[PDB]
Amino acid sequence: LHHALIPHGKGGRSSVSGIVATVFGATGFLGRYVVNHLGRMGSQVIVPYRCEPYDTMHLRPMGDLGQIIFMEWNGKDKDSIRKVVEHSNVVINLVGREWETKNFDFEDVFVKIPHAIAQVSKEAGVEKLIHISHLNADIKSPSRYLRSKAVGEKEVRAAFPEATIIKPSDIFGREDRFLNYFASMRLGKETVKQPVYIVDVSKGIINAIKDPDAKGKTFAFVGPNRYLLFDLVQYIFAVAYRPFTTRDKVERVHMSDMTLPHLPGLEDLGIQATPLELKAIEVLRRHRTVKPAKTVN
Amino acid sequence: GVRTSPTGEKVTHTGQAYDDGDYRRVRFSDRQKEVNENFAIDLIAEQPVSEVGSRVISCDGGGGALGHPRVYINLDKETKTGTCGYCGLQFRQPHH
Amino acid sequence: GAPMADVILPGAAYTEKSATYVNTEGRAQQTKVAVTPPGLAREDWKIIRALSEIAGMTLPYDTLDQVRSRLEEVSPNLVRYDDVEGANYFQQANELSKLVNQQLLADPLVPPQLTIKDFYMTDSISRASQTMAKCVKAVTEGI
């Protein structure tokens, strides 16, 4: 099994876990948590970055000496992808932009880039590939974001048969847009949301790395309880002690969260989902200058 | 005499070179592998063998106090040539 | 013994485990861990216990001290680590040995270790040593 990756040590910072992971788009909200979880157990991380190396500095102190290697890349060139995933045995894809750009539209971000990554990883001998798409991703969705997500999911499955598709649902956390977006407005009663904690998503990804039977499975990462939009916003504003993104985001938030009971979730990976009540105060303490919202199940 | 690995890297004078399957090779991408071009074994193998007419010869590496500790080498064996322990220079009696 | 196997379980060498060996005098002595087994190799009794628990026939012992207590139960002598004295039961064994009357064959007693060249390579560790191969080559032909 290519001895260099035989696990060693007690699973600490200076141990060896036998994981060589390439985390595409690791400079985002979820990428930092994924890279931190990978590096705290001694795994080697390859970070492909397209931004200024200054913006990636926060990832440096999350690994031991020589365990994090930063590499330049871009989605328009397959050679950079080939040289980035050449030696990795795990490839995690977190590339995704929530808005349009004159260089990268949703089709480029969510379809062509994941397809190229999956094809190059298959050609390079990578054994594990993890791809992340939205939970509500449907080919018939009104929004282009979810249609592209749906098309991308099919492409990865076609190119990488042994890929693992993970479908989180509106991740919330310290740097998430789900809570900060609603706390920065300073309409509902028919739409329900199922937020999921960021650490839970990162641990689910890590366990999917470790789990051997999760080769071709598809997961749906959802929270413990469902919230109507109105009372969830009420709770968000109450935590902050505050009295009560162009066109695609409003449509996307106005859609109701889907239900997929056939798809396995966090419990199948041995993770107990953390309710929003425990971490809402931690997230929203910085928006300042208790009666939790009712749930529907 | 720097060789090249079958993968493509240069082999160090100690013979170290990552094989095809080693993941640690990724540390050299977009960078370089530090290798010393001058090999001590090749440089010392091309030194001429000194011809002295004494049974026992003294070597201090040249320079006196700037060399190695002074040692004495016996040259009775006519099959091979006496080699200094530190410096690696060779000495030989005048056969024939 | 390896290529003829169907499942191979990597064990530990005598320098990689705290293990009990009894010499030819009946004296029991224990080794100490100098290094750890390479790769994914594990201790032999640990492998046996894990296999037993997987199969559902879980063994009572969990740690080394419990295995040595089991050894004491099976045999009292094994726990002592420098005692060599024992009872003399020559009479009973001798009297029991006079029943069967097998005959000797007309073959001379030739030991396997006829010459120094046969002494170097005896077990698996010796056969895997370059030094032993050098010794055998030097003994067979000298320069």
Add this chain to the structure above:
Amino acid sequence: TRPTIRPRNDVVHKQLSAFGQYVAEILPKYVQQVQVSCFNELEIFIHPDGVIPVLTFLRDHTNAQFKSLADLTAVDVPTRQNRFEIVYNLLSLRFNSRIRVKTYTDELTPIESSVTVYKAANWYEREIWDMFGVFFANHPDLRRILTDYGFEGHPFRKDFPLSGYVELRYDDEVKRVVAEPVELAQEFRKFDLNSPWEAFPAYRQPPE
């Protein structure tokens, strides 16, 4: 005795021996032994209960008046039943002299604090409690002075590992500094520098 050998002074040796006998005569209840080293250093071994009296004597007697407390420290010798050894170093300015007082204690036996005698002892006593775990009774405030808050164990004991048990780092998931079990990239290489062929026959011990 050529210029490579440290010269020996006999007058100071005689004076220190005489003063040691004098002190041991005055306080026979507490002093257990008196020694004078080959380099003219006088030390007094006393009972633990005599810390307050003896020190006070050495600070107040017209013939001793050891006014200054130069140092106060502890020595750990695990092979002894009384593990810790407390050392007081006193300097007398009037007579231009130095003395040493040695006491023994263990983990659970407390030693009376000498803050009343010497104020300078205060922090020193705390330091001992921080490094060895010796408790000093009737101390104005006894707490850690050198180790981190919440540090578990006393580092200067001989059975405490050199690198400790925990190490600090920064975690971004919890956005704070956290403590983990210690894991070294390179283990501290232990060297067996001690050699056979004893060097000092004058310190040879009986073969019991």
Add this chain to the structure above:
Amino acid sequence: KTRFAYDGLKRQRLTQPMIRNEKGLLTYTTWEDALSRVAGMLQSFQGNDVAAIAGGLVDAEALVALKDLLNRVDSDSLCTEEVFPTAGAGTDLRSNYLLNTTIAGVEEADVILLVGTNPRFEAPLFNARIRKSWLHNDLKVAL
């Protein structure tokens, strides 16, 4: 052999579990897979169908663990490579298969008889002790 055969500890080492694949070759797997296959095969069979052979470098802990494991499946086919005559007392009497006089007690003997043995290469330290007693105690040797 004791002094210079440690080199073999660095060659031909078994580091990972191995199982036979579809083509019949040995391929690396995890501990869980190999243990599951072995446990399934051990559960399917029972009695004299299971057996074990102990090598020449196995410790007492592994021996007793394997004995317990094969006893939990009602088996007694526990064998070693070297043979010992079981007729009569066999292994029930401990003094029937030991060096009773002991290496230290060799020095007190005055005559010795060696039967079908080459102690120089089978037990070099035993032969060294015999030689020392022969040189100092004027011991008489017959082979």
Add this chain to the structure above:
Amino acid sequence: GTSVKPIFSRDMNEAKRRVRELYRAWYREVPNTVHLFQLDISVKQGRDKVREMFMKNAHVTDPRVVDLLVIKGKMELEETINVWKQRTHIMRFFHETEAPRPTDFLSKFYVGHDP
């Protein structure tokens, strides 16, 4: 014989009383610490942690050891009162960042050679 010098308590009753007073102080202080240090835990979690740390040393049957532990606990409580610590020092009691080590034989057999 085995006569020893006391520290604070002559027998086990006085040591138990001092343990009780220290527990009262910690129980009273937990909510103030939670509010002041702006912890993410609740008062229930802090009180449960205090109870667990007290019950960790429940097998001690020596009055000297008991009242030395009481002295250490009083020192730590005083450290907590005056805000000499920070959030990290308080939160080191919960090991939220350390992976959970397993207990059964099979898991320890799989991870490594650690007994």
Add this chain to the structure above:
Amino acid sequence: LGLREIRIHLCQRSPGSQGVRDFIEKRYVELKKANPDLPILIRECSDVQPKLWARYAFGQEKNVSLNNFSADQVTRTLENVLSGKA
């Protein structure tokens, strides 16, 4: 229900094992005559109670003490063990 082997642990110098020792020195060979296939291991203890261990099918083991037992007592409990009666 089928006996597989028996073990007799006796202490060489202790007096509590004394009679047990006599047992062997008088009749063990005769016992081995009656059971040419049953393994009766004999081992030495040290400051421990003399004991007899019997192993039945599938790994069941039962132990019985032998302190201060006379030769008749130990041979009697032995015949009880092999005969299967309890």
Add this chain to the structure above:
Amino acid sequence: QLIAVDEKLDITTLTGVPEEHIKTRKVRIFVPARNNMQSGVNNTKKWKMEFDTRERWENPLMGWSSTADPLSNLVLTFSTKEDAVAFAEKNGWSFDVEERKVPKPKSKSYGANFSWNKRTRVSTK
């Protein structure tokens, strides 16, 4: 003034050692063996207490040796066996103690080399 309590000493809860490093370690109390390369015997006078060896692995970067256990480099010196045993019991460590080995007295005679009839005659000197 004196408690006069009768119980064994135990300072396990005061040393601050982690629980996994108390009930899992196995200390060894022994007189270190003489180094066979030298004839000096000055290193076999005191008793040594040392902990068992644990895992060491190769560092992925630079190839150094890494150890995950703190007590690996620890060694303690004791005057007698009883003191070391008492220390081990007081700290709550399970211990294995080995009796000191001393070379037996040997009778050496110069006269034996030139023996008239015995086999101790030397072939050369």
